[PDB]
Ligand binder design. Sequence first.
Ligand SMILES: Brc1cc2nn[nH]c2c(Br)c1Br
Ligand SMILES: [Cl-]
Ligand SMILES: [Cl-]
Ligand code: NA
Length: 333
Amino acid sequence: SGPVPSRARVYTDVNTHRPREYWDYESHVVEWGNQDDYQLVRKLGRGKYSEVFEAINITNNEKVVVKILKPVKKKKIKREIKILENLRGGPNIITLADIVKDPVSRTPALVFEHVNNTDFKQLYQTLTDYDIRFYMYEILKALDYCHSMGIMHRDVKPHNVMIDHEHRKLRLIDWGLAEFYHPGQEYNVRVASRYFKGPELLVDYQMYDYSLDMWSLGCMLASMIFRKEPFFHGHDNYDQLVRIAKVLGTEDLYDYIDKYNIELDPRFNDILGRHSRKRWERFVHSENQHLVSPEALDFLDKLLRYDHQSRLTAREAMEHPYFYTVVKDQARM
Ligand SMILES: Brc1cc2nn[nH]c2c(Br)c1Br
Ligand SMILES: [Cl-]
Ligand SMILES: [Cl-]
Ligand code: NA
């Protein structure tokens, strides 16, 4: 028999109850603006693949960010646009300001509200305990919002979190891999960066949901409180599951495989071996012990589960004791 079907524990049917138009991005009609309303100032450093620029809107002299959409399926362009329009105004979600094409090249581009190109990866190995809790809570606001709106991000990693540390402001960026959640849909498992990939992606379980983002968030939290970048340091996608198995143990992995009747790639046969579930105390040392608390470990443990159904939801995570002081200071402020 095939794999056992799965449903999201929360926000399962939100797209079903919407008008077709909300999620049917292939039928979305874009009104393409004129990229000549903008002048590019400078290229932001986003590595070899990406083309993101600081720009000026000539009309109002306001600073924007312009993302040139590298040759790709028009379908993927409409998906990212529709998701950004749907989430516009959500907490800690980047704001889409315009959709334009260069008059000559006809290359499509997205224009965003300005944010400084200071990503979380540049800051997140130097935070106080309180600031890890604070920024984690701000990321959860964005994830509970997009999940509540029927969308999973699928590329949650420090490079996709822009922070203004002076103003204590955070934005979740790069919605290019985001997808609408539909119950029973089988998704592409070739998403997310290696170190942040959930076990569902690594064992090719396609009927995944919002809980994929909660695994990625757990990987970020583990990296920050233990000062270990990345936390799960695989050579490749096969070794990535081995690195997870040496921490979470093989017993819970094989129970997960049996529960969903997953056909494990034969390449895993010799490399997973047999591993105990390790106590988190094993990762604590003199240079990270100020970031590690019972509250932090209890919270992390509830994010990093093989079984996607078992992981905290974004809202359950926001309700964890780890955030009590952040919640109290927010109400007071
Ligand atoms: Br604003 C902003 C929005 C983005 N969407 N994808 N990548 C993005 C980057 Br880099 C920035 Br900065
Ligand atoms: Cl990253
Ligand atoms: Cl142990
Ligand atoms: Na401690």
